[PDB]
C-alpha cells in the first residue's frame, strides 16, 4: 500500500531556456518564433500582385517597350520587383519625386489605363510619328515609350500646344509627362522649332513652369541629351492643362486609380505561385499565427514582429527528467 | 473555543483579467486607463489657447479679411483648427513650407503684431490702395489681406522697389510675403509695366530670387492667376531686404515671436473653457496621473501613452469569493 | 517531486498505485486539467494580445534623403532591439514562472495528500507515502478523488505505529 506524488516524464527532446537555467528539457513546448516560409510568392489578401519581373516600375509605368507585354491588373495588393530590375527609364534621365510615386502606387484599390489624348486626333498640328529614339529600341525597331508620345516640329513649324483634360471621372487620375533636354542647341533647333521655349503644366492643385536646360552632358547609353519625368494626380473634376512651345513629351495614356490601404514594394527573385497568404515576406509567403518571425523585416501586411533571436519557445509542460 | 483565518469580501463588481484566468472579481482595484474626458478644450501651461473657429492657419497668418473677428493673444499654448476651417488663403495658390510654418507657430511665449512697413510712408512711389480681388470678398466688396498688400503701378509706371527692415528687437521676427503670377502676358502688362520682372528677398542667411511664371491656368475661385506665399525668420540684429521690379506682394505687418516649439496643432470642433490641465486631446482635456489612456493617438502635452486596449485595471485587493 | 515518471500514458500530474490487488500510474485528473487550462490561457494571452495592423515596412529613399533613410533604419533598429529584448525576457520569465507554477501544483498535491491523511500514513520524504494501515483500491480511489477519511481506519494505523 504505497502512494507517491510526481509528474509525467516523456521522450521529448525540446529544450527551453529560462532565467535561472539554460538548456532545460521540457516534456511539451510551444514555438513562438516562426522560421519557415513557403519559398514562393503568393497573393496577399487573395488579390494578385503586379509582377514586373525584369522591368522596373518607371519602365512599366511609362510603357517601356521592353516590358510592353506586362498585363495590367485592376487591383494590386503589393508590387514585386526583381533584384535584376532594369529597363526602367529607357532614355537617360531622372524622375523627380520618384519615390513618392512608387510609394503611392504600392497599393491601389482600382487601376485602369485609358488613352487621355488620342494620338490620331489630339495633335493634328504636330508630327507624332517621329518621336523615336535609338536608346531603347523594341526588337531593333528604334521605338519609344508606349504611355507617352514625344512631339516634334512638323514642316519646320511648332504651334503652341494648348491641350487640357477635364477629368470627368470619379477617381483620381495619374498623369505623367516629361521634359526633353537636348544635347546641344543644334539638336534643339533640328528637333524643335523656337530655340527659346517654355513648357507649363498645371491643375488647380499643381502649377509649374519648366524651361529647357541645354548643355552637352556625359554620355549615357548612346545619347547625351536627357529627359526629366514628372507626374501629378488630377483630382476628380479638376481640369489639367498643358501649355507649351518647348520640349514637352505629351502623355498618350493616363491611369484612373483609387488608392487602397498603404502597402509596400518587395524586391525579390522568388517565383510567383498562385495561393493566398496572411503575410508576404521577400523569401516567400508566411501564413503563421505566432507572435514572432525571423524572416527579413521588409514584410508587407499584418505580420509577426521581427526579432533577431534564433529561438523563442514557451514551456507548457514540466522539465523532462526521467528517473 | 475555535478560530478561523480568512480574507475579507465585499459587494464589489470590479472585473480584473489575469494571465491564467479572465474576469476575476476583486474587492478593490485601480483603473490605470483613462477613458473619460470633459468634452472641452482648455488651457495648457496656464496660457489661453488660440482658437481659430472658422479660420485656417494660412487665413489668420496672412490676415484674411473674414478672420478679422478674431483677436490675437500675447502667448499661445497650442493652435486649435476646426473641421470647417475653409477660410484659408483667398487667392488661388500654394503656400511653400506651409507645414513648417505651422510647426514654428505651434506655441509662442511672446507674440506681437508689428507694423513693419506703414502704408502711409513706405511706398510713396506705388499705389497701395488697389489690389483687391473678387476671390477675397469682404462685406460684399472686393478686398484683400490685411497683413500683406499687393502693389500695382501708380502712374503707368512701376519704379524699381528697394526696401529693407532692420530688426531692432530682441526677438525673432516672422516676415510673410508673396509673389503674383498673372494669368497671361496682357494681364501682367496692364497690371505691371515692366512685364519682365523679378522679385528678390534676402537676409544674412536667406537669399532667393524669384521670377514670374506667366501661363494660362485652370480657373480657381473665378481667377486664373496664382499667388505664391513665402515666409522667413529674421534673427535679432539682422535685416530683411525686399528688392523687386514687379509682381511682389509685400507685408504690412510682421510678427515678433519668442518661439516655444514644444507644442503641436490640434484639430477639434469643441469649445475652449477655463481650467488648467497638463494635456489636451481633440475629444477633450484630461486630468490624470495614470500611465495609460485610450482616448486618441494625437494629443498635446504631458499625457499617458495612447493604448488601444479596452481596460488596464490593476488589482490591489484579493479575490472575491462569497462564502 | 524528485523526478518525472515515464510510465504515465495520459496526464501531467498523477499518483503511483502499488497495492496487493494491482498496480499502475493513475493521473490526477482535476489538477492536471486546471493547470493545463491555466497554461493554455497563459499562452493564448501571450499570443493573442499582440496587436497587429495591416502595415508595410521598408522604404525607398533618394541619395539626398540619406538622413531620413538612416532614421528609418534607426526606427527599425530600435524596434528590433525592443522586440528582441522584451521577447527574450518574456519567454525567459514565462518559462521560469511556468516551471515554478508546475512545481507548485505538484507540491500542492503532496500537501493535498498530507493534510488529508492527518497522520494516518508514514511520510517518506522522497515524495512518496507508505500507508501504515491496510488500504484497499476503494480506499486508494478515495484518496485520489480527494474524499478520504482518517477516522475510517484510524485505530489500526495507531496500532501499526506502536508496532514500530
Amino acid at each position, epitope marked *: 500500500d504505497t502512494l507517491c506524488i510526481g509528474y509525467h516524464a516523456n521522450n521529448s527532446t525540446d529544450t527551453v531556456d529560462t532565467v535561472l537555467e539554460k538548456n532545460v528539457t521540457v516534456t511539451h513546448s510551444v514555438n513562438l518564433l516562426e522560421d519557415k516560409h513557403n519559398g514562393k510568392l503568393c497573393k496577399l489578401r487573395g488579390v494578385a500582385p503586379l509582377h514586373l519581373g525584369k522591368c522596373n516600375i518607371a519602365g512599366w509605368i511609362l510603357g517601356n517597350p521592353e516590358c510592353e507585354s506586362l498585363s495590367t491588373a485592376s487591383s494590386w495588393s503589393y508590387i514585386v520587383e526583381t533584384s535584376n530590375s532594369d529597363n526602367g527609364t529607357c532614355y537617360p534621365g531622372d524622375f523627380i519625386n520618384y519615390e513618392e510615386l512608387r510609394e503611392q502606387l504600392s497599393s491601389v484599390s482600382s487601376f485602369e489605363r485609358f488613352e487621355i489624348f488620342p494620338k490620331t486626333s489630339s495633335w493634328p498640328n504636330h508630327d507624332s510619328n517621329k518621336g523615336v529614339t535609338a536608346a531603347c529600341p523594341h526588337a531593333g525597331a528604334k521605338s519609344f515609350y508606349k504611355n507617352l508620345i514625344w512631339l516634334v516640329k512638323k514642316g519646320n513649324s511648332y504651334p503652341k500646344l494648348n491641350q487640357s483634360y477635364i477629368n470627368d471621372k470619379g477617381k483620381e487620375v495619374l498623369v505623367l509627362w516629361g521634359i526633353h533636354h537636348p544635347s546641344t542647341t543644334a539638336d534643339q533647333q533640328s528637333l524643335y522649332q523656337n530655340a527659346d521655349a517654355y513648357v507649363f503644366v498645371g491643375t488647380s492643385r499643381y502649377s509649374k513652369k519648366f524651361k529647357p536646360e541645354i548643355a552637352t552632358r556625359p554620355k549615357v547609353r548612346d545619347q547625351e541629351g536627357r529627359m526629366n519625368y514628372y507626374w501629378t494626380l488630377v483630382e476628380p473634376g479638376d481640369k489639367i492643362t498643358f501649355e507649351a512651345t518647348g520640349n514637352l513629351v505629351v502623355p498618350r495614356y493616363a491611369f484612373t486609380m483609387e488608392r487602397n490601404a498603404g502597402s509596400g514594394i518587395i524586391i525579390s527573385d522568388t517565383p510567383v505561385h498562385d495561393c493566398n497568404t496572411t503575410c508576404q515576406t521577400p523569401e516567400g509567403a508566411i501564413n503563421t499565427s505566432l507572435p514572432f518571425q525571423n524572416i527579413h523585416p521588409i514584410t508587407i501586411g499584418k505580420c509577426p514582429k521581427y526579432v533577431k533571436s534564433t529561438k523563442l519557445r514557451l514551456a507548457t509542460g514540466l522539465r523532462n527528467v526521467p528517473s | 473555543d475555535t478560530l478561523c483565518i480568512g480574507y475579507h469580501a465585499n459587494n464589489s463588481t470590479d472585473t480584473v483579467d489575469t494571465v491564467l484566468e479572465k474576469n476575476v472579481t476583486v474587492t478593490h482595484s485601480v483603473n490605470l486607463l483613462e477613458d473619460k474626458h470633459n468634452g472641452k478644450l482648455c488651457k495648457l501651461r496656464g496660457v489661453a489657447p488660440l482658437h481659430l473657429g472658422k479660420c485656417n492657419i494660412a487665413g489668420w497668418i496672412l490676415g484674411n479679411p473674414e478672420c478679422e473677428s478674431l483677436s490675437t493673444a500675447s502667448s499661445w499654448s497650442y493652435i486649435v483648427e476646426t473641421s470647417n476651417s475653409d477660410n484659408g488663403t483667398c487667392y488661388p495658390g500654394d503656400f511653400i513650407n506651409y507645414e513648417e510654418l505651422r510647426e514654428q507657430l505651434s506655441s509662442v511665449s511672446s507674440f506681437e503684431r508689428f507694423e513693419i512697413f506703414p502704408k502711409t510712408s513706405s511706398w510713396p512711389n506705388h499705389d497701395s490702395n488697389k489690389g483687391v480681388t473678387a476671390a477675397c470678398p469682404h462685406a460684399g466688396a472686393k478686398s484683400f489681406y490685411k497683413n500683406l498688400i499687393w502693389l500695382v503701378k501708380k502712374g503707368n509706371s512701376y519704379p524699381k522697389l528697394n526696401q529693407s527692415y532692420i530688426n531692432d528687437k530682441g526677438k525673432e521676427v516672422l516676415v510673410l510675403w508673396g509673389i503674383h503670377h498673372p494669368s497671361t502676358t496682357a494681364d501682367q502688362q496692364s497690371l505691371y509695366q515692366n512685364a519682365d520682372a523679378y522679385v528678390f528677398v534676402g537676409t544674412s542667411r536667406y537669399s532667393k530670387k524669384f521670377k514670374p511664371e506667366i501661363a494660362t491656368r485652370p480657373k480657381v475661385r473665378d481667377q486664373e492667376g496664382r499667388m505664391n506665399y513665402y515666409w522667413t525668420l529674421v534673427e535679432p540684429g539682422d535685416k530683411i531686404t525686399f528688392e523687386a521690379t514687379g509682381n511682389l506682394v509685400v507685408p504690412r505687418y510682421a510678427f515678433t515671436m519668442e518661439r516655444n516649439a514644444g507644442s503641436g496643432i490640434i484639430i477639434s470642433d469643441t469649445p475652449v473653457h477655463d481650467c488648467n490641465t497638463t494635456c489636451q486631446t481633440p475629444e477633450g482635456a484630461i486630468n490624470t496621473s495614470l500611465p495609460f489612456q485610450n482616448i486618441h493617438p494625437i494629443t498635446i502635452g504631458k499625457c499617458p501613452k495612447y493604448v488601444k486596449s479596452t481596460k488596464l485595471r490593476l488589482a490591489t485587493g484579493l479575490r472575491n469569493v462569497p462564502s | 517531486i524528485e523526478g518525472g515518471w515515464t510510465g504515465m500514458v495520459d496526464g501531467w500530474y498523477g499518483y503511483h498505485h502499488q497495492n496487493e490487488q494491482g498496480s499502475g500510474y493513475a493521473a490526477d485528473l482535476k489538477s492536471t*486539467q486546471n493547470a*493545463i487550462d491555466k497554461i*493554455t490561457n497563459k499562452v493564448n494571452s501571450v499570443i493573442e494580445k499582440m496587436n497587429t495592423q495591416f502595415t508595410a515596412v521598408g522604404k525607398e529613399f533618394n541619395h539626398l534623403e540619406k538622413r531620413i533613410e538612416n532614421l528609418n533604419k534607426k526606427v527599425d533598429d530600435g524596434f528590433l532591439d525592443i522586440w528582441t529584448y522584451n521577447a527574450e525576457l518574456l519567454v525567459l520569465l514565462e518559462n521560469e514562472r511556468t516551471l515554478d507554477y508546475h512545481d507548485s501544483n505538484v507540491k500542492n498535491l503532496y500537501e493535498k495528500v498530507r493534510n488529508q491523511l492527518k497522520n494516518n500514513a508514514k511520510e517518506i520524504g522522497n515524495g512518496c507515502f507508505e500507508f501504515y494501515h491496510k488500504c484497499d483500491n476503494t480506499c486508494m480511489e478515495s484518496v485520489k478523488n480527494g474524499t478520504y477519511d482518517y477516522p475510517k481506519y484510524s485505530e489500526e494505523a495507531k496500532l501499526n505505529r506502536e508496532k514500530i
Partner: antibody
C-alpha cells in the same frame, strides 16, 4: 468519426428523460461532448457541455438544477438526464464533439463543434 | 454574451453575393467564433473555424472574415446546397458557447 443518438420517445410532463450519445472513430476521452437544443423553428440554443476526460460539466445558468450529465468511459457513451420536462421543451437535441482536454490548444479548430449527431427528436406533449 | 444576426440576405438569387454578417455584443478574439450551416432535414455541419481561416472538407467558395464585434461570412458564389440556415457560434471565457439567431436564404 460518428455520433449516434438513441431512439426517440414521447414523454408526459413531470417525468425525467435519459438521452444517450454513442461516439466512435476517435479516442473518446480526448474530446468533450456538448449538447445543443433545437426547438421547431427559432434556432440553436446551447444546452450544456461535459468533459469526457475529467467529468467536469457546465450548464446554462437559466437551466441550472434540471440538467445533469454523466459519461460512461467503459462503454463510450454519454448520458443526459433532463428533469421536470415541460411541453415547450419539445425539440431535437444534438450531440457534438467539443473542446478537447489533456493538451495545449493553440488552434482555433478545437473551440468548435465539428462532428454532430443525427438528433434524438424528443417530443413532449 | 449575445450576438445579433441582423440578416441582410433574406431573399436573393443563386449566383450573387450573400453579404451576411454577424455582430457580437462585446469585442471577442477571432479564435473563438465559428460559422455553421444546417440544411433543414439534415444535421448541422461546421463551415468556418475562426474568422480568419477554413481547414475542413468543404468547397473553397466558403470564406469568412471579421474582427472585434463585426464578423462576416461573405460566401462568394451560391448553389442549391448553399441555401441553408446559417449560425454564429461564440466561445466565452468559461467552457460555454452561445449562438445567434441565424437566417434562412429563400431560393
Amino acid at each position: 468519426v460518428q455520433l449516434v443518438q438513441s431512439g426517440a420517445e414521447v414523454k408526459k410532463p413531470g417525468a425525467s428523460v435519459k438521452v444517450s450519445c454513442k461516439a466512435s472513430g476517435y479516442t473518446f476521452t480526448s474530446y468533450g461532448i456538448s449538447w445543443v437544443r433545437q426547438a421547431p423553428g427559432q434556432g440553436l440554443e446551447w444546452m450544456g457541455w461535459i468533459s469526457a476526460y475529467t467529468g467536469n460539466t457546465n450548464y446554462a445558468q437559466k437551466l441550472q438544477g434540471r440538467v445533469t450529465m454523466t459519461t460512461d468511459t467503459s462503454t463510450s457513451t454519454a448520458y443526459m438526464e433532463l428533469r421536470s420536462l415541460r411541453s415547450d421543451d419539445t425539440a431535437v437535441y444534438y450531440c457534438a464533439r467539443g473542446l478537447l482536454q489533456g493538451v495545449v490548444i493553440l488552434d482555433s479548430y478545437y473551440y468548435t463543434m465539428d462532428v454532430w449527431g443525427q438528433g434524438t427528436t424528443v417530443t413532449v406533449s | 454574451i449575445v450576438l445579433t444576426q441582423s440578416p441582410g440576405t433574406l431573399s436573393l438569387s443563386p449566383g450573387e453575393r450573400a453579404t451576411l454578417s454577424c455582430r457580437a455584443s462585446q469585442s471577442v478574439s477571432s479564435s473563438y467564433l465559428a460559422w455553421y450551416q444546417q440544411k433543414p432535414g439534415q444535421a448541422p455541419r461546421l463551415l468556418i473555424y475562426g474568422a480568419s481561416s477554413r481547414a475542413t472538407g468543404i468547397p473553397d467558395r466558403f470564406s469568412g472574415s471579421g474582427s472585434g464585434t463585426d464578423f462576416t461570412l461573405t460566401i462568394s458564389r451560391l448553389e442549391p446546397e448553399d441555401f441553408a440556415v446559417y449560425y454564429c457560434q461564440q466561445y466565452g471565457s468559461s467552457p460555454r458557447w452561445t449562438f445567434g439567431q441565424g437566417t434562412k436564404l429563400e431560393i
